[PDB]
Amino acid sequence: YSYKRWVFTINNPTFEDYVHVLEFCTLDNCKFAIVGEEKGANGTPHLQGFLNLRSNARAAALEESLGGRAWLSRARGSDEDNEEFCAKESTYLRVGEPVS
DNA sequence: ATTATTACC
């Protein structure tokens, strides 16, 4: 039950949430990663992203890697589907290139 | 696992 391709959301992200995302979402760990940040007026601020990991991870392990407050789900769309969705966010961090 | 109603297809 360990997988490479995941989506995640971190609602009301904390300092440590950002620190975990910044250290983990790197080319060392990911073939491709994209993480958007939205914190506008009438909604809960979030980090929201997609990870195509180099190594399989069990959900409990990825949860720890992302700071322990993340919602996780096995990715259902393609890397490019996720790139297009997350790149709509007003700020985003993009690591690597989508795999097809 | 986990905070939320946001979350790819």
Author numbering: 7 to 106
What wording appears in the published article?
HUH endonucleases are diverse enzymes that contain an eponymous motif consisting of a pair of conserved metal-coordinating histidine (H) separated by a bulky hydrophobic residue (U). Replication-initiating HUH endonucleases (Reps) are sequence-specific nucleases that cleave and rejoin single-stranded DNA (ssDNA) during rolling-circle replication.
To better understand the roles that coordinated divalent ions play in Rep function, we resolved two cocrystal structures of the endonuclease domain of DCV Rep in complex with a cognate ssDNA 10-mer (5′-TATTATTACC-3′) derived from the DCV Ori, with and without manganese coordinated in the active site. Precleavage complexes were obtained using the dDCV mutant. Interestingly, four waters occupy the active site in the absence of Mn2+ coordination, and the ion-coordinating triad side chains shift slightly away from the direction of the space occupied by the cation in the Mn2+-bound structure. However, we observed a notable loss of 19 total contacts (4 of which are hydrogen bonds) at position T−1 when Mn2+ is not present, indicating a dynamic localized conformational shift in that region.
